[PDB]
Amino acid sequence: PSEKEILDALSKVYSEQVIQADDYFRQAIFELASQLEKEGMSSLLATKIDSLINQYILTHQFDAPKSIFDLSRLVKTK
């Protein structure tokens, strides 16, 4: 479960029309992916993406594109 796979999974989520259409989630994902790219992965960052993706999933009543669930899965693993 590598630093790059998570970064790519973030980018996949970021590119989603429903994420692009929403200024809070778009920027949030953008910031987390930049922190990862810059500093690498961490416990903390894992926690932050987890919280953001939980928030996205719950806010949308489990109606989220596959990539969101894919990302969610990856950061849940660690």
Numbering used by the authors: 2 to 79
Quote from the publication.
In order to neutralize the toxic effect of the peptide on the "producing" cell the genes encoding bacteriocins are generally co-transcribed with a cognate immunity protein. These small proteins (typically 88-115 amino acids) interact very tightly with a specific bacteriocin or pair of bacteriocins and protect the "producing" microbe from the toxic effect of its own bacteriocin. Sp-PIP belongs to a large family of putative bacteriocin immunity proteins.
The crystal structure of Sp-PIP was solved by the single wavelength anomalous diffraction (SAD) method using selenomethionine (SeMet)-substituted protein. The crystal asymmetric unit contains 78 (out of the 102) well ordered residues and 74 water molecules. The first methionine and the 23 C-terminal residues are disordered and cannot be identified in the electron density maps. One additional short helix (H2, residues 17-22) connects helices H1 and H3. In the structure, the N- and C-termini are very close together (7 Å). The structural comparison results suggest that Sp-PIP is most closely related to Imb2, from subgroup C. These results suggest that Sp-PIP is highly likely to function as a bacteriocin immunity protein with similarities to proteins from group C.
